[PDB]
Protein backbone atom coordinates (compact mmCIF):
# COMPACT_ATOMS: atom_id res chain seq x y z
CA UNK A 1 0.00 0.00 0.00
CA UNK A 2 2.04 2.88 -1.40
CA UNK A 3 0.06 6.15 -1.19
CA UNK A 4 2.99 8.00 0.47
CA UNK A 5 5.37 7.28 -2.46
CA UNK A 6 3.02 7.58 -5.46
CA UNK A 7 0.88 10.64 -4.84
CA UNK A 8 1.58 14.29 -3.98
CA UNK A 9 -0.87 16.99 -2.88
CA UNK A 10 -1.54 20.21 -4.77
CA UNK A 11 -0.16 21.90 -1.69
CA UNK A 12 3.16 20.03 -1.89
CA UNK A 13 3.27 20.64 -5.64
CA UNK A 14 2.86 24.42 -5.50
CA UNK A 15 5.69 24.63 -2.93
CA UNK A 16 7.97 22.51 -5.10
CA UNK A 17 7.49 23.82 -8.63
CA UNK A 18 11.19 24.67 -8.92
CA UNK A 19 12.70 22.01 -6.64
CA UNK A 20 15.92 20.18 -7.70
CA UNK A 21 15.36 17.19 -9.97
CA UNK A 22 11.56 17.52 -9.93
CA UNK A 23 9.72 17.96 -13.25
CA UNK A 24 6.00 18.54 -13.82
CA UNK A 25 4.41 16.94 -16.85
CA UNK A 26 0.90 17.60 -18.13
CA UNK A 27 -0.68 14.70 -20.00
CA UNK A 28 -3.93 14.83 -21.94
CA UNK A 29 -5.76 14.00 -25.18
CA UNK A 30 -4.21 16.96 -26.97
CA UNK A 31 -2.26 19.87 -25.61
CA UNK A 32 -4.98 22.43 -26.08
CA UNK A 33 -5.46 22.84 -22.32
CA UNK A 34 -1.72 23.05 -21.67
CA UNK A 35 -1.24 25.62 -24.46
CA UNK A 36 -3.87 27.86 -22.85
CA UNK A 37 -2.18 27.61 -19.49
CA UNK A 38 -0.34 25.14 -17.29
CA UNK A 39 1.38 24.64 -14.00
CA UNK A 40 4.45 26.90 -13.99
CA UNK A 41 7.45 25.18 -15.56
CA UNK A 42 5.47 22.11 -16.61
CA UNK A 43 6.09 20.42 -19.97
CA UNK A 44 3.51 18.53 -22.03
CA UNK A 45 3.14 15.01 -23.41
CA UNK A 46 0.45 14.58 -26.08
CA UNK A 47 -1.21 11.27 -25.38
CA UNK A 48 -2.16 10.80 -29.07
CA UNK A 49 0.88 12.09 -31.01
CA UNK A 50 3.73 11.48 -28.52
CA UNK A 51 2.74 8.27 -26.77
CA UNK A 52 1.02 6.18 -29.40
CA UNK A 53 2.67 4.26 -32.26
CA UNK A 54 1.59 6.15 -35.37
CA UNK A 55 1.20 2.97 -37.46
CA UNK A 56 0.62 -0.14 -35.34
CA UNK A 57 -1.99 -0.33 -32.59
CA UNK A 58 0.41 0.03 -29.66
CA UNK A 59 2.05 2.71 -27.58
CA UNK A 60 5.70 3.67 -28.12
CA UNK A 61 8.41 1.07 -27.52
CA UNK A 62 11.33 1.60 -25.13
CA UNK A 63 13.56 3.36 -27.68
CA UNK A 64 10.79 5.70 -28.89
CA UNK A 65 9.91 6.46 -25.26
CA UNK A 66 13.58 7.14 -24.45
CA UNK A 67 13.91 9.39 -27.48
CA UNK A 68 10.80 11.33 -26.54
CA UNK A 69 11.87 11.91 -22.90
CA UNK A 70 15.40 12.90 -24.03
CA UNK A 71 13.91 15.53 -26.39
CA UNK A 72 11.52 16.91 -23.70
CA UNK A 73 14.29 17.12 -21.09
CA UNK A 74 13.27 14.39 -18.58
CA UNK A 75 16.11 12.42 -16.90
CA UNK A 76 16.07 8.94 -15.38
CA UNK A 77 16.91 10.51 -12.03
CA UNK A 78 14.18 13.17 -12.13
CA UNK A 79 11.12 12.86 -9.94
CA UNK A 80 8.29 13.15 -12.49
CA UNK A 81 4.97 14.64 -11.30
CA UNK A 82 2.14 13.84 -13.73
CA UNK A 83 -1.15 15.73 -13.91
CA UNK A 84 -3.95 16.50 -16.30
CA UNK A 85 -7.56 17.22 -17.19
CA UNK A 86 -10.02 14.67 -18.48
CA UNK A 87 -10.08 13.41 -14.83
CA UNK A 88 -6.31 12.67 -14.63
CA UNK A 89 -7.09 9.60 -16.85
CA UNK A 90 -4.35 10.27 -19.29
CA UNK A 91 -1.99 11.28 -16.49
CA UNK A 92 -2.67 7.90 -14.89
CA UNK A 93 -2.15 6.27 -18.33
CA UNK A 94 1.24 8.03 -18.53
CA UNK A 95 2.06 6.98 -14.95
CA UNK A 96 1.47 3.38 -16.03
CA UNK A 97 3.77 3.91 -19.09
CA UNK A 98 6.50 5.29 -16.83
CA UNK A 99 6.31 2.22 -14.54
CA UNK A 100 6.19 -0.08 -17.57
CA UNK A 101 9.51 1.37 -18.70
CA UNK A 102 11.12 1.16 -15.26
CA UNK A 103 11.03 4.75 -14.01
CA UNK A 104 11.47 4.79 -10.24
CA UNK A 105 10.54 8.26 -8.98
CA UNK A 106 7.15 9.22 -10.43
CA UNK A 107 3.93 10.35 -8.82
CA UNK A 108 0.48 11.68 -9.64
CA UNK A 109 -0.68 15.14 -8.57
CA UNK A 110 -3.73 14.12 -6.54
CA UNK A 111 -6.84 15.48 -8.27
CA UNK A 112 -4.84 16.68 -11.29
CA UNK A 113 -5.84 19.88 -13.13
CA UNK A 114 -9.41 19.78 -11.77
CA UNK A 115 -8.22 20.00 -8.13
CA UNK A 116 -5.54 22.62 -8.96
CA UNK A 117 -8.11 24.84 -10.67
CA UNK A 118 -10.69 24.28 -7.95
CA UNK A 119 -8.06 25.39 -5.40
CA UNK A 120 -7.65 28.58 -7.44
CA UNK A 121 -3.90 27.96 -7.76
CA UNK A 122 -1.97 29.99 -10.35
CA UNK A 123 -1.49 28.75 -13.89
CA UNK A 124 0.87 30.15 -16.50
CA UNK A 125 0.79 30.64 -20.25
CA UNK A 126 4.56 31.23 -20.55
CA UNK A 127 6.21 28.80 -22.98
CA UNK A 128 8.52 26.17 -21.44
CA UNK A 129 11.56 24.47 -22.96
CA UNK A 130 13.94 22.20 -21.02
CA UNK A 131 17.52 21.36 -22.01
CA UNK A 132 17.56 17.90 -23.64
CA UNK A 133 18.63 14.93 -21.58
CA UNK A 134 19.74 11.38 -22.24
CA UNK A 135 16.87 9.18 -21.02
CA UNK A 136 17.30 5.40 -21.28
CA UNK A 137 14.23 3.27 -20.54
CA UNK A 138 14.23 -0.31 -19.33
CA UNK A 139 12.54 -3.06 -21.36
CA UNK A 140 8.81 -3.25 -20.62
CA UNK A 141 7.76 -4.77 -17.31
CA UNK A 142 4.96 -6.94 -18.61
CA UNK A 143 3.98 -8.03 -15.12
CA UNK A 144 1.78 -4.90 -15.27
CA UNK A 145 0.33 -5.37 -18.79
CA UNK A 146 -2.14 -7.98 -20.03
CA UNK A 147 -2.44 -9.12 -23.64
CA UNK A 148 -5.44 -10.75 -25.36
CA UNK A 149 -4.39 -14.41 -25.00
CA UNK A 150 -3.78 -14.06 -21.26
CA UNK A 151 -7.09 -12.24 -20.76
CA UNK A 152 -8.98 -15.08 -22.45
CA UNK A 153 -7.04 -17.54 -20.22
CA UNK A 154 -7.90 -15.46 -17.13
CA UNK A 155 -11.66 -15.97 -17.36
CA UNK A 156 -12.69 -17.52 -14.02
CA UNK A 157 -9.05 -17.46 -12.85
CA UNK A 158 -8.32 -13.78 -12.14
CA UNK A 159 -10.46 -10.80 -11.06
CA UNK A 160 -11.48 -8.90 -14.18
CA UNK A 161 -12.46 -5.35 -13.33
CA UNK A 162 -14.57 -3.61 -16.03
CA UNK A 163 -14.43 0.12 -15.35
CA UNK A 164 -16.84 1.21 -18.10
CA UNK A 165 -20.36 2.54 -17.43
CA UNK A 166 -23.02 0.14 -16.25
CA UNK A 167 -24.91 0.39 -19.57
CA UNK A 168 -21.83 -0.59 -21.53
CA UNK A 169 -21.09 -3.39 -19.07
CA UNK A 170 -24.55 -4.93 -19.38
CA UNK A 171 -24.39 -4.59 -23.17
CA UNK A 172 -27.39 -2.26 -23.35
CA UNK A 173 -25.15 -0.02 -25.46
CA UNK A 174 -22.17 -0.89 -27.66
CA UNK A 175 -20.25 2.29 -26.80
CA UNK A 176 -14.04 5.66 -32.60
CA UNK A 177 -13.97 3.40 -29.51
CA UNK A 178 -16.21 0.79 -31.09
CA UNK A 179 -16.29 -2.98 -31.30
CA UNK A 180 -18.23 -5.77 -32.99
CA UNK A 181 -20.28 -6.91 -29.98
CA UNK A 182 -21.67 -5.43 -26.76
CA UNK A 183 -21.30 -7.06 -23.33
CA UNK A 184 -18.45 -7.76 -20.92
CA UNK A 185 -15.82 -10.44 -20.30
CA UNK A 186 -17.48 -13.39 -18.53
CA UNK A 187 -17.18 -13.20 -14.75
CA UNK A 188 -16.03 -9.58 -14.89
CA UNK A 189 -17.19 -7.20 -12.18
CA UNK A 190 -18.21 -3.63 -12.97
CA UNK A 191 -16.67 -0.80 -10.95
CA UNK A 192 -17.07 2.33 -13.08
CA UNK A 193 -13.71 4.18 -12.76
CA UNK A 194 -15.21 7.36 -11.26
CA UNK A 195 -16.39 5.61 -8.08
CA UNK A 196 -12.77 5.72 -6.95
CA UNK A 197 -12.53 9.50 -7.15
CA UNK A 198 -13.99 12.49 -5.27
CA UNK A 199 -15.89 15.37 -6.86
CA UNK A 200 -12.75 17.52 -6.76
CA UNK A 201 -10.78 14.85 -8.67
CA UNK A 202 -8.79 13.47 -5.74
CA UNK A 203 -8.55 9.74 -4.99
CA UNK A 204 -10.83 8.43 -2.26
CA UNK A 205 -9.38 7.16 1.03
CA UNK A 206 -7.89 3.70 1.42
CA UNK A 207 -10.91 2.83 3.60
CA UNK A 208 -13.44 3.98 0.96
CA UNK A 209 -11.49 2.27 -1.85
CA UNK A 210 -11.07 -1.10 -0.08
CA UNK A 211 -14.83 -1.18 0.67
CA UNK A 212 -15.75 -0.24 -2.89
CA UNK A 213 -13.85 -3.16 -4.46
CA UNK A 214 -14.59 -5.65 -1.69
CA UNK A 215 -18.35 -4.94 -1.98
CA UNK A 216 -18.22 -5.26 -5.79
CA UNK A 217 -16.64 -8.68 -5.43
CA UNK A 218 -12.83 -8.31 -5.76
CA UNK A 219 -11.48 -11.70 -4.67
CA UNK A 220 -8.34 -11.40 -2.55
CA UNK A 221 -7.37 -15.02 -3.37
CA UNK A 222 -7.00 -14.03 -7.06
CA UNK A 223 -4.69 -11.83 -9.15
CA UNK A 224 -6.31 -9.02 -11.17
CA UNK A 225 -6.71 -7.42 -14.61
CA UNK A 226 -8.46 -4.10 -15.24
CA UNK A 227 -10.01 -2.97 -18.56
CA UNK A 228 -12.22 -0.34 -20.23
CA UNK A 229 -12.58 0.51 -23.98
CA UNK A 230 -8.98 1.55 -24.60
CA UNK A 231 -6.28 1.43 -21.92
CA UNK A 232 -7.60 4.74 -20.39
CA UNK A 233 -9.96 4.63 -17.37
CA UNK A 234 -8.52 1.25 -16.65
CA UNK A 235 -5.08 2.82 -16.07
CA UNK A 236 -6.65 5.05 -13.40
CA UNK A 237 -8.16 1.97 -11.76
CA UNK A 238 -4.92 0.02 -12.13
CA UNK A 239 -3.22 2.83 -10.13
CA UNK A 240 -5.89 2.56 -7.42
CA UNK A 241 -5.57 -1.22 -7.16
CA UNK A 242 -1.77 -1.61 -7.36
CA UNK A 243 -0.31 1.65 -6.06
CA UNK A 244 -2.81 2.79 -3.41
CA UNK A 245 -4.40 -0.51 -2.30
CA UNK A 246 -1.18 -2.51 -2.57
CA UNK A 247 -2.23 -5.47 -4.67
CA UNK A 248 0.99 -6.86 -6.11
CA UNK A 249 -0.48 -8.67 -9.11
CA UNK A 250 -2.48 -6.16 -11.16
CA UNK A 251 -2.28 -5.82 -14.95
CA UNK A 252 -3.77 -3.19 -17.25
CA UNK A 253 -5.36 -4.76 -20.33
CA UNK A 254 -4.69 -1.93 -22.78
CA UNK A 255 -6.38 -3.72 -25.71
CA UNK A 256 -9.56 -3.49 -23.64
CA UNK A 257 -13.07 -3.83 -25.19
CA UNK A 258 -12.12 -2.26 -28.52
CA UNK A 259 -9.88 -5.32 -28.97
CA UNK A 260 -11.81 -7.97 -27.02
CA UNK A 261 -15.25 -7.06 -28.45
CA UNK A 262 -13.80 -7.42 -31.98
CA UNK A 263 -12.13 -10.79 -31.48
CA UNK A 264 -13.69 -13.73 -33.34
CA UNK A 265 -15.14 -16.36 -31.00
CA UNK A 266 -14.31 -14.69 -27.67
CA UNK A 267 -16.67 -15.54 -24.77
CA UNK A 268 -19.07 -12.68 -24.02
CA UNK A 269 -21.46 -12.20 -21.13
CA UNK A 270 -24.52 -9.91 -21.06
CA UNK A 271 -26.51 -8.01 -18.47
CA UNK A 272 -26.12 -7.13 -14.86
Swiss-Prot record:
Occurrences of domain Rhodanese (ranges): 18-125, 154-269
Residues where substrate binds: 233
EC number: 2.8.1.1
Enzyme active site: 228 (cysteine persulfide intermediate)
Domain of life the protein comes from: Bacteria
InterPro entries in alphabetical order: Rhodanese-like_dom, Rhodanese-like_dom_sf, Thiosulfate_sulfurtransferase, Thiosulphate_STrfase_CS
Annotated catalysed reactions: thiosulfate + hydrogen cyanide = thiocyanate + sulfite + 2 H(+)
Gene Ontology molecular functions: thiosulfate-cyanide sulfurtransferase activity
Coiled coil: none
Described purpose of this protein according to its UniProt entry: May be a sulfotransferase involved in the formation of thiosulfate.
Domain writeup: Contains two rhodanese domains with different primary structures but with near identical secondary structure conformations suggesting a common evolutionary origin. Only the C-terminal rhodanese domain contains the catalytic cysteine residue.
Official protein name in the record: Putative thiosulfate sulfurtransferase
Name of the gene encoding the protein in the UniProt record: cysA1
Amino acid sequence: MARCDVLVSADWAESNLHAPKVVFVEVDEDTSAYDRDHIAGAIKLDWRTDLQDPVKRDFVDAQQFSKLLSERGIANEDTVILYGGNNNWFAAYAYWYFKLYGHEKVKLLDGGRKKWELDGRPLSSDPVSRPVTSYTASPPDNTIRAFRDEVLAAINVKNLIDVRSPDEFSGKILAQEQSQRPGHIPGAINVPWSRAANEDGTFKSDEELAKLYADAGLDNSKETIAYCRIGERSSHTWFVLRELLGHQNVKNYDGSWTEYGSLVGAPIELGS
